[PDB]
């Protein structure tokens, strides 16, 4: 034991949410992005905007499936390009991740989903 | 009367909206993107998407706001710049509007919000 490797090195999915303010009868609504991390040592899952600010991150941590499925927690399966995730309520539109993602996802047999 | 004027001209906005489809638990999406014209001559309004094909067009026609408000039409001045509009139950997000229609805005007192 104690062999060097850097095989569990995180995957990173570039998504972004409209933060939706419901002012009476009228929605307005601005674009966030997000760098989304998603760790395969201990499935867990962070999220920072790469841009008293609010909903700037989330903390590296399991994160659970939304409901009815908050027995269980997000795993690296859940994630691809054209899907949605929902942390906290809020719902993240996946829309892209880079090429090492993109290899290990194919070495795990995921099929990687066109543009969106 | 008769004298020549195209003093209504349509004015244009720039919009999106995820289709978003459910299987299951997992939610799919694709971002589509359209040009919602605005006829000032009789507060029509008209939708194209640029790009059997379902979901490409709302033909011209007035509009009536969402609910509880279906007993009104949508005007000019529920259209900007980071605002959402719902026609037919799918909600259109505005992102931007040319020169022409920003400066019509103007014109009638209307401040465009800042990009999204």
Do not use: M
């Amino acid at each position: 034991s104690g062999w060097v490797a850097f095989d569990k090195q995180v995957l990173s999915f570039d998504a972004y949410l409209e933060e939706e303010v419901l002012d009476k009868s009228q929605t307005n609504y601005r674009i966030r992005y997000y760098k989304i991390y998603f760790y395969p040592e201990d499935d867990t899952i962070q999220v920072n905007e790469p841009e008293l600010l609010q909903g700037t991150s989330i903390r590296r941590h399991r994160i659970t499936l939304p409901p009815p499925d908050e027995d269980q927690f997000y795993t690296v399966y859940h994630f691809n390009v054209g899907t949605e995730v929902v942390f906290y309520g809020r719902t993240f539109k996946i829309y892209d991740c880079d090429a090492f993602t993109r290899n290990f996802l194919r070495k795990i047999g995921v099929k990687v989903n066109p543009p969106v």
